[PDB]
Amino acid sequence: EHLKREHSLIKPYQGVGSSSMPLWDFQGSTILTSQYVRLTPDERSKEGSIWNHQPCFLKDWEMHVHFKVHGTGKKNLHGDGIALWYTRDRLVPGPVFGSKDNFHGLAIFLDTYPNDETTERVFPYISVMVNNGSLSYDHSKDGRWTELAGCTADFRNRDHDTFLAVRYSRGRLTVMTDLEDKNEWKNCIDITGVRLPTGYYFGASAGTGDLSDNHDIISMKLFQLMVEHTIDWTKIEPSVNFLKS
Ligand SMILES: [Ca+2]
Ligand SMILES: [Cl-]
Ligand SMILES: [Cl-]
């Protein structure tokens, strides 16, 4: 395989129920079992996260995330969601799906509650954000101002496993979903001109506010992609270049 075990979270989770070294830190409301990592319980005002121990120096990679978001809150009465991160900093809790705002790097947000009273989107909504420290995620508008790309995705309270794939290679960022039990990656997001350095950390976080939900990570499997390259990659500033209209 091109699986990088050191950047993966897999049952039985290394170093947790044993003497070996763990590969992730568990932070905040996060709790372990043998079958999942629960970032938040179905309780209000929680923030939990997991952060990979080692910085990733792969230039080209694909993360497969087996997650589960589930709860008993009626109607639209659930929240807030999960974020996946490839960021300069790790372990800092905060208001952005459990983690710090004004981050450096990449976020993939799985947003389950529409804060935006005048929203056009259908939720739950998966979106991507690239940040160089300057941008703040605006909850009241569901991060509308800072979203690069996004898609509606029915990932909540499902009777079968739910997965997301996040692929990053040569400026191209692709997010795909497997939510329907078709054993198929369905496209959600596909953009180019994304500039991210090496040496950042993988992480996942979730938060709840006045509304709650269980947010579980079952596994995260990171694969190295076999990509020819013909420059200090740790010094790349996170940014996006845009095609002119
Ligand atoms: Ca929201
Ligand atoms: Cl692990
Ligand atoms: Cl279902």
Side-chain angles (χ1 to χ4, degrees):
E1 283 278 53
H2 302 293
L3 183 82
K4 305 280 101 182
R5 185 61 191 89
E6 72 263 32
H7 301 305
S8 314
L9 174 87
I10 305 177
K11 317 197 258 209
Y13 309 113
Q14 167 163 326
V16 178
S18 85
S19 63
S20 39
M21 204 142 149
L23 299 164
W24 305 77
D25 293 317
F26 312 78
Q27 182 285 331
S29 58
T30 287
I31 65 141
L32 263 303
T33 66
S34 56
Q35 288 313 289
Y36 51 82
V37 179
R38 187 150 282 174
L39 298 171
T40 71
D42 200 351
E43 280 144 33
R44 306 179 296 182
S45 300
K46 305 295 193 202
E47 300 87 39
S49 70
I50 54 189
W51 287 97
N52 199 213
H53 278 204
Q54 28 194 315
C56 180
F57 298 92
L58 301 192
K59 292 167 181 75
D60 308 87
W61 54 254
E62 187 170 332
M63 177 66 80
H64 289 190
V65 174
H66 182 187
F67 68 93
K68 200 183 153 46
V69 175
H70 53 112
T72 39
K74 296 201 180 293
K75 314 183 311 190
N76 212 140
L77 289 186
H78 53 259
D80 300 324
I82 292 182
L84 308 175
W85 304 99
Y86 175 75
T87 57
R88 199 190 62 188
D89 307 326
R90 51 186 319 246
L91 290 164
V92 190
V96 185
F97 306 93
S99 186
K100 75 184 297 266
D101 209 352
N102 297 84
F103 56 92
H104 299 252
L106 174 64
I108 307 94
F109 303 135
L110 287 79
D111 187 2
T112 70
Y113 187 73
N115 295 107
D116 191 342
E117 246 158 292
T118 55
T119 186
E120 324 200 347
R121 302 184 269 188
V122 181
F123 280 69
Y125 195 83
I126 300 181
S127 61
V128 48
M129 175 178 174
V130 172
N131 201 344
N132 70 328
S134 280
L135 314 176
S136 178
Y137 178 85
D138 181 2
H139 285 86
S140 77
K141 308 313 259 166
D142 296 307
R144 183 213 287 188
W145 321 131
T146 51
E147 150 198 359
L148 299 185
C151 86
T152 163
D154 194 356
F155 60 76
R156 228 201 130 248
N157 273 355
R158 288 301 214 119
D159 287 338
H160 45 264
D161 294 350
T162 56
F163 309 78
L164 185 91
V166 177
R167 181 197 182 266
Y168 181 67
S169 180
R170 297 187 74 90
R172 188 179 177 187
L173 180 68
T174 319
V175 182
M176 307 178 282
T177 75
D178 170 21
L179 307 185
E180 303 297 341
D181 206 38
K182 295 166 187 162
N183 188 51
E184 204 180 23
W185 295 125
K186 169 174 188 290
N187 187 243
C188 174
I189 294 166
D190 204 357
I191 59 190
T192 63
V194 173
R195 281 185 57 70
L196 291 176
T198 57
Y200 274 15
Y201 297 99
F202 290 105
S205 69
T208 64
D210 289 332
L211 304 169
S212 64
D213 232 352
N214 298 285
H215 304 99
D216 305 339
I217 301 297
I218 318 320
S219 65
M220 302 176 76
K221 306 176 181 165
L222 192 279
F223 305 93
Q224 179 181 15
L225 300 170
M226 288 318 106
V227 175
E228 184 176 31
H229 289 282
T230 69
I231 181 153
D232 194 354
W233 289 64
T234 66
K235 297 275 225 158
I236 302 185
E237 286 187 42
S239 65
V240 178
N241 295 336
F242 303 91
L243 203 70
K244 293 170 72 178
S245 66

